[PDB]
Amino acid sequence: MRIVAADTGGAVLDESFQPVGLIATVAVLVEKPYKTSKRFLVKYADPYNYDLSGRQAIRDEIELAIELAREVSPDVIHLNSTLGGIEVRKLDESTIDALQISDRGKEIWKELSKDLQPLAKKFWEETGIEIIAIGKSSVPVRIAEIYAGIFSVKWALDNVGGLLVGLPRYMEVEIKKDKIIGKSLDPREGGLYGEVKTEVPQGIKWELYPNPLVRRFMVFEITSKS
Amino acid sequence: MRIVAADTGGAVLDESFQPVGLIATVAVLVEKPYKTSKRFLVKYADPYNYDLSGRQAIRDEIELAIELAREVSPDVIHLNSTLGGIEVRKLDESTIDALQISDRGKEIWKELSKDLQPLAKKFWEETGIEIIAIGKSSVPVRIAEIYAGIFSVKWALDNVGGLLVGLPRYMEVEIKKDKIIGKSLDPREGGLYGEVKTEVPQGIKWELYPNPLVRRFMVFEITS
Amino acid sequence: MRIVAADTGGAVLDESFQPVGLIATVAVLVEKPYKTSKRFLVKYADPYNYDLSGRQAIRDEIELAIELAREVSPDVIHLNSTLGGIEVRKLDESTIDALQISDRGKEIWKELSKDLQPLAKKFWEETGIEIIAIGKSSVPVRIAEIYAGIFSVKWALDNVGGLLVGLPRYMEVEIKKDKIIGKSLDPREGGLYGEVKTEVPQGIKWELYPNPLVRRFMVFEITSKS
DNA sequence: AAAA
DNA sequence: AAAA
DNA sequence: AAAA
């Protein structure tokens, strides 16, 4: 099967490792063997003017996903929200309460459905393609998340005297002359990876290391040789 | 310590990666250093006539484990159900209510005890060996699960014009000229593996890749 | 950031892999890149006269961390307890009930607070350093745990006709000629490790293998050649 | 629910 | 809450 | 509870 998925991830961190704002929203097309993506879109946010409790991320995710989906016509869209695979077009207050989720999760999504449910309904009317909230269960979602990490590092390289990027969960990045590679650190996932072309700037040093306050998350730090 | 454990696993999947039915029930003997098994039994189900919500799996498991136990006389039997290590022979509705599990889990075992508890009682009487529901905690149970995976692939090799097999959680298989090797993909488990001798047919291609719908589960695909 | 963390870990096991008692309490200093510690303290317990239930451990940990902290003046102390990051000086009957932890945990810490809360208060008054119950989230706590493992093996080597050591969760140890190395087995953690100097006695053999009754925990076993 |  |  |  052919799947379009999206995720928002990558954060600017302050010096005590507290998130300031998110960076990259990515939509990816994933096909067999479901390890990477060769066709994807990115939209950068402004992390210094970001509402971390604003939940603009998922609105960005579905729009980018639909934009990619219109170009490549997948079998399904995977949205990063763990609701058990329920179709977003079937999302009303009735079906939300029946979900096996937290009370906070139910109230976040009753408010979100007001824009997203009509969006998904119209896209389905147009194409027959469902938008499903599968979240943690989805491999395409994890691949989008890996790419959000890569594009965040690409963003950091392009916008740096010092920057701390908090990567999405247990992934690493590698810097090469003409590209950035991102890989899951979890071998249980079966070797998920991504790769993006970019020019790596001069006069900067970088390091990748564990976030001391959030175990299994890495930090990518850029410093100027100044 | 010498342990017999059992598990059912491996599923035939349709073209949209949905499970059709389970394949292999395996009982293993596990001994020090507790990384693999050299002595085991397999039972094949019919995945095309299987009730996934039917729980013949756990019934198959205890029977097979008992069959193996009678032959190799272990210290204990491990059953793949996470109930905190309570003896199956001591499982009645009284002790079931006290178990710290979901009510769905409670209603499942109220039904199961009716058959299994007398069996465990009878088996304990004969041998002194306990049958304990330990599940996720047991390394022998995970080694059986890995073997279930290997045997599912063997099943795939024996019945292939094209098949998709969903393996148990995060394990890989490698096919060599005369055998199938299965390994946990989780280095935290400390290097669990299994190996089965089988004849590999000619004229086939196979591939192993992530189930796109079930993260950390792999798919084994084989074509003629 | 500079962090002091502490943990109690390592157990003597009987022949059927049941824990008899714990071995090592360690405080560690962790600095960038937050993968290991080069400065640490250990206190060994008597595993054969130990009350597993319990809580002499946390008392030892906070004492040991304060002792290390006085020497190295960290930014914060992490105690191995997952309470959401609440300062131990702020632990009273009111705030303990507000914690999203089990009813068992709440009644336990109302008892612990009577000794620990004044201790953290006095230390904060003196230095401005908070002692926080962060637990599972802290990389420094995980590094302390690894060191607890290493020191537990050192203890076994120094006190061994046969010993079984149950290590902390998913870590391995390597014996070298003049030292013991400990490593996390989880690559998602980003390569956490430790190293402790010791003399390896003669006339003994060792093996590392899975604890069959506790999945993802390893056993370090020592046997005499006599 | 999501984020580091 | 912690421990193997 | 188990299965992918």
Author numbering:
A (entry chain A), C (entry chain C): 1 to 160, 164 to 229
B (entry chain E): 1 to 160, 164 to 227
Question: Which of the paper's sentences describe this entry?
Answer:
Here, we report the crystal structures of PhoExo I, which shares 76% amino acid sequence identity with PfuExo I. In this study, we determined three substrate-free structures of PhoExo I and four structures of PhoExo I in complexes with ssDNAs. PhoExo I forms a trimer in solution similar to PfuExo I. The 3′-5′ exonuclease assay of PhoExo I showed that PhoExo I cleaved an ssDNA from its 3′-end at every two nucleotides, and the cleavage stopped at the third to fifth nucleotide from the 5′-end. PhoExo I is predicted to utilize a DEDE (RNase HIII)-type catalytic motif for the hydrolysis of ssDNA. PhoExo I is a novel RNase H superfamily protein.
To examine the mechanisms of ssDNA recognition and cleavage by PhoExo I, we cocrystallized PhoExo I with poly-dA, poly-dC and poly-dT. To prevent the degradation of ssDNA during the cocrystallization, we used the D80N mutant of PhoExo I; the corresponding mutation was previously utilized in a cocrystallization study of the B. halodurans RNase HI―DNA/RNA hybrid complex. In this study, we determined the crystal structures of PhoExo I in complexes with poly-dA, poly-dC and poly-dT at 2.05 Å, 2.50 Å and 2.05 Å, respectively. Each crystal contained one PhoExo I trimer and three oligonucleotides in the asymmetric unit. Although the overall structures of the PhoExo I―ssDNA complexes were nearly identical, PhoExo I formed some base-specific interactions with ssDNAs. In addition, the base groups of the poly-dC and poly-dT formed direct hydrogen bonds with Arg55 and Arg104, and they formed water-mediated hydrogen bonds with Phe17 and Asn214. These interactions may support the substrate recognition of PhoExo I; PhoExo I prefers poly-dT because PhoExo I forms the largest number of base-specific interactions with poly-dT compared to poly-dA and poly-dC. Meanwhile, tracts of adenines are known to exhibit strong base stacking tendencies and increase rigidity of ssDNA. Because the active sites of the PhoExo I trimer are covered by the flexible α2 and α3 helices, it is hard to recruit structurally rigid or partially structured ssDNA to the active sites. PhoExo I may disfavour structurally rigid poly-dA as a substrate. The PhoExo I―ssDNA structures determined in this study are predicted to present the distributive cleavage state of PhoExo I. In this state, PhoExo I recognizes ssDNA only at the active site pocket that accommodates the 3′-OH terminal 4 nt of ssDNA, so the 5′-terminal 3 nt are disordered in the complex structures.
